[PDB]
């Protein structure tokens, strides 16, 4: 019936298991596409697996890293490490490459990469709620940890490099923000106006439309160059 | 009256805003002077403004760090982060680079050398005291805090650098370390001594002497090598 | 007479002053080993001193930023600090480099070696169980910490050579583990299933055990390419 009803379901929808299985089969594809990332897997397959937790709990690490937490705290969740784990390992090691073509699937791709953006979205305002609680007037640490919170490894892509082996000074995802990095730079700004009331509108609705802004550029991207 | 008793209003001086204003206007400035930051201002404005906040509370960050806080617990203080936000605005973007032009002014920069110095050894000192306040025998916790809260970016160089693009293993301040790397370690071990009380000097005794030598050195060799 | 009450009297040596002085000595004569090191000592000292604290509290340090405590935490602990600086001192600037020549001494060498090992042991089961108390069933936090509580310095290993003005990026220890470091792994596993009652041992059993295993690897590895 009403939207900032409706709103309601959706800013709720528990993302465990199924938004996170579908956030961490799209950064560990990505993981897959990286270079070098194969022959990494069969020669050094314990960094493969600390790369995929990268890809899959970077947001975790390096919010935990600026409000002065355990960057490992997240990996208390036991569930969710090992949910990453089994994609990681079907990813990289399925007999006939199997979960990877079906995975790889556009139409599947497509649904997946929609779901990562409902996680992202929800992380990025938990990133600033979370901060809020602990500064309530801390706008800038606000901004900052929704902005890990939503960028995630991006934002740790030199260091990333460096566990693979690769060093690539000259660039990085602040000096050049990609768009996922850009978007949750401007999403974490709007979930901290909310938060500091200066933006009229329901936590709930501003899940809801910035969710659906997101899934439509990534689902459009996604499907233009594939 | 009484000298003990100048030094007591001396080392008592309210920094904020015009003694802060002062240190951001000199590390904004020396920031604007590494090469590529005026084009990382036009081309990659955010970085360069996360640049200027390294320089601005590169001590705060790396004293969090060491003791285990927030790294960006400083970023709490909205009028200060606003403050040096304003200050590097100036410095890069002023019509007619007029502010560039004033601060410049050999003068005026030299006061602001000066009122540099006196928040670094305030900040030297309020570093031991609080290593000292969380450990009362951890002596070499309070000299590594007096320290970083001394030399600020300087200490975190090589990844001032990483950040604008700009990779130089070669060195770094503590394999190498820089005049006020050096009389930041002095420094530190001073206040650390009287922390201790084998340094037989009253705290506001020590911080009006040091920073009369800190600002006789830097106001020396600014005025040299101008 | 009983062998598990052998156990609890190996277990609970106390490592302070002699096994940790032995871990010191074996761990600066490595640091003394690596390229440039002599060099540095004679132009940069304050910056091989921090060095060789790597060396020594390179366990400690990692440890302590995994759980987001004060990576010099240990720091507080003079007496163990002065020790570890008068190993540097000796090793580096005796006179007639004497010291260096006695604990080189291959027989002197390798009991040094093995009580080295004694502590490495001691260390990764002190890691499982100070995660543990902090998360009853964070397996993978145990796992992380006593990893970094074996293996030391090498995992920043990179970060040690950036000190020293070296770069090599294209290897680290979690890419290409050393025989300590995987040993390192192997180790916080057994004492993890250990605490988690899934492993029948006791704890000084599994410490005696370990501890011989390693001892036994590594004096001969160290007797083998001498
Ligand atoms: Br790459
Ligand atoms: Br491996
Ligand atoms: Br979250
Ligand atoms: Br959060
Ligand atoms: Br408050
Ligand atoms: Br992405
Ligand atoms: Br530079
Ligand atoms: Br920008
Ligand atoms: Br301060
Ligand atoms: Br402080
Ligand atoms: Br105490
Ligand atoms: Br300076
Ligand atoms: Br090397
Ligand atoms: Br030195
Ligand atoms: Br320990
Ligand atoms: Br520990
Ligand atoms: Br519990
Ligand atoms: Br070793
Ligand atoms: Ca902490």
Redesign the interface.
Known sequence: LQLGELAAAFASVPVFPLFDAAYFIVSVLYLKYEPGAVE?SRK?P??SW?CAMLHCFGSYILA??????????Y??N?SS?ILATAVWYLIFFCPMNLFYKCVSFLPVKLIFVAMKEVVRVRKIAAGVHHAHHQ?H?????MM?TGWVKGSGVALMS?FEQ??????R????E????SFPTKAS?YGTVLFTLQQTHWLPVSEANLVFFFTMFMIVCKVFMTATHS
């Open positions: 990494m050094s314990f960094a600390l935990d890293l600026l409000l002065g937490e355990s960057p490992i705290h990996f208390s036991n490490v500064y007037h801390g706008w800038f640490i900052a030199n460096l566990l693979r082996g690769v060093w000074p000259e660039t990085n602040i000096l050049h923000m730079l």
